[PDB]
């Protein structure tokens, strides 16, 4: 009923390993770019 | 030429000190350049 049984699991192992690598790396790339905004500081200086 | 003008034009005074020197004292002169900001003296 499922001749692809063993192959999908071997692939699934590779998918999990690749995601274990790519997810935190892309997340690191996301935080790198966003750091410009996350640490930005604002100040309001109206005339008075 | 090579030297940019003291003030580049485009299109602040609140004290005596900053005002001294503002009064004109000589006839007017107008300059135009190829490489330098224009000026008008006096």
């Amino acid at each position: 009923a499922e001749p692809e049984h063993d192959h999908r699991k071997r692939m699934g192992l590779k998918m999990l390993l690749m995601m274990g690598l790519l997810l935190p790396l892309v997340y690191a790339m996301k935080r790198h770019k966003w750091s410009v905004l996350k640490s930005r500081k604002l100040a309001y200086r109206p005339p008075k | 030429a090579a030297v940019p003008a003291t003030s580049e034009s485009p299109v602040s005074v609140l004290c005596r000190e900053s005002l001294r020197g503002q009064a004109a004292g000589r006839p007017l002169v107008a300059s135009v350049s190829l490489n330098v900001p224009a000026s008008v003296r006096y």
Binding site: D6, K9, R10, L13, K14, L17, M18 | -
Partner: protein
């Protein structure tokens, strides 16, 4: 008077765009070989004795 690994990786590999690309091409072909061999070994070990490649010797001669 001595740099760090990342500083060296920067200077020789990442700075120039032509070299940042050659680095990825090369790294990709090397990673592919090591990753596939490694993951395949993990999969086959988790399933030791169950795969056709493990029992094949018993029937081969063809």
């Amino acid at each position: 008077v001595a740099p760090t690994l990342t500083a060296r990786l920067y200077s020789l590999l990442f700075r120039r765009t032509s070299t940042f690309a050659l680095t990825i091409v090369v790294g990709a072909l090397f990673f592919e070989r090591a990753f596939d061999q490694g993951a395949d070994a993990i999969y086959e070990h988790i399933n030791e004795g169950k795969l056709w490649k493990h029992i094949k010797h018993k029937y081969e001669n063809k």
